[PDB]
Amino acid sequence: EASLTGAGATFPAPVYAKWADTYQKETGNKVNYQGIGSSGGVKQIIANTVDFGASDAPLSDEKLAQEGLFQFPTVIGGVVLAVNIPGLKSGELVLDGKTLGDIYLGKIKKWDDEAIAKLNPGLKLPSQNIAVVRRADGSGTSFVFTSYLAKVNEEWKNNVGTGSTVKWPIGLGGKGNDGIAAFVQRLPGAIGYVEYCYAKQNNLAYTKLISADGKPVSPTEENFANAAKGADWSKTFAQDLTNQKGEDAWPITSTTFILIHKDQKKPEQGTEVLKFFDWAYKTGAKQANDLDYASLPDSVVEQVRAAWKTNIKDSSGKPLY
Ligand SMILES: O=P([O-])(O)O
């Protein structure tokens, strides 16, 4: 029995809570995860106050070498646009990336705007103001969401850009993925970006999006998996999965990372962190799929195991796996 502590991204917090609960029941090891968003996770592992950090924004090779850190992917998820449009069902509104951007820029103000109605011909769109919601805390989901908007709206790209934290033109700030969820639910007219789990479990209506290739997709585990189908995992783990080509490829997809130290000053702790995530890879794929997360392919998991053996050591040079 060991007590491990992790902190970071809220994006995969439901799968990690679920994995942790099952592992305790099967083995008695305790995992404590604090959802505080990816920036916090990164600071906390750097400070050495947790056993493991989590972030959906990959550090660069230089950055990992400078801090003594190793990073590895766990699951693939999808970010959706949760909406509160009185009278609209889940999956009936269709947005494109340029339209989505123009909402977040503050350019489109009403739900029956010409640009929105042209995308959804059948619908009877209300004349309700749009209330944009966005994150207040340094976030991995913000990263992924502003990475996607920088590729499909050139005014966003030039005026706001990409980051964990940016200068939001308009909108109300919610803390965590659970805070955007709560916000949408209370505000008639609201739109907020959440990892798909948080809209499904809260029963929030969500849109469809038009893929890179120009077809409207739904967000579904399969569709998240489809967006990752042509990723070259053998070159890097830091893959960008936003606006991918292919059939039924969800446009705002992403993987997520775990960060640990390479020179493990507490080898027992470090050894138990690896066993947990090995356990999850080996047996956790149903729980992940049950929260609509796609799993990594077997070849990637084999990559991580090979890199565990080469990189993770104690202060005597000895490997931990
Ligand atoms: O996963 P987040 O909390 O860093 O968005």
Overall description:
Its main location: periplasm. InterPro entries: ABC_phos-bd_PstS, PBP_domain, Phosphate-bind_PstS. The complex is composed of two ATP-binding proteins (PstB), two transmembrane proteins (PstC and PstA) and a solute-binding protein (PstS). The chain has 13 helices and 15 strands. Strand 1, helix 1 and strand 2 form a beta-alpha-beta unit. The protein is α/β, with parallel strands linked by helices. The protein folds into 2 domains: 155 residues, Periplasmic binding protein-like II (D-Maltodextrin-Binding Protein, domain 2, 3-Layer(aba) Sandwich), CATH 3.40.190; 166 residues, 3-Layer(aba) Sandwich (D-Maltodextrin-Binding Protein, domain 2), CATH 3.40.190.10. The structure holds dihydrogenphosphate ion (2HP). Dihydrogenphosphate ion binds next to helix 6 and helix 8.
What is the compact description of this entry?
The chain is an alpha/beta fold.
Q: What fold name goes in the CATH topology slot of the largest domain?
A: D-Maltodextrin-Binding Protein, domain 2
Principal-axes shape call: elongated
Question: What is the assigned CATH homologous superfamily of the largest domain?
Answer: Periplasmic binding protein-like II
Question: Can you tell me the CATH architecture of the largest domain?
Answer: 3-Layer(aba) Sandwich
Overall tally of domains: 2
Please tell me how large the radius of gyration is: 20 Å
Query: Helical segment tally?
Result: 13
H-E order:
EHEHEHEEHHEHHEHEHEEEHEEHHEHE
Strand content: 15-25%
Calculate the terminal CA-CA distance, rounded to whole Å: 18 Å
Function: Part of the ABC transporter complex PstSACB involved in phosphate import.
Protein name: Phosphate-binding protein PstS
Family: Belongs to the PstS family.
Pfam families: PBP_like_2 (PF12849)
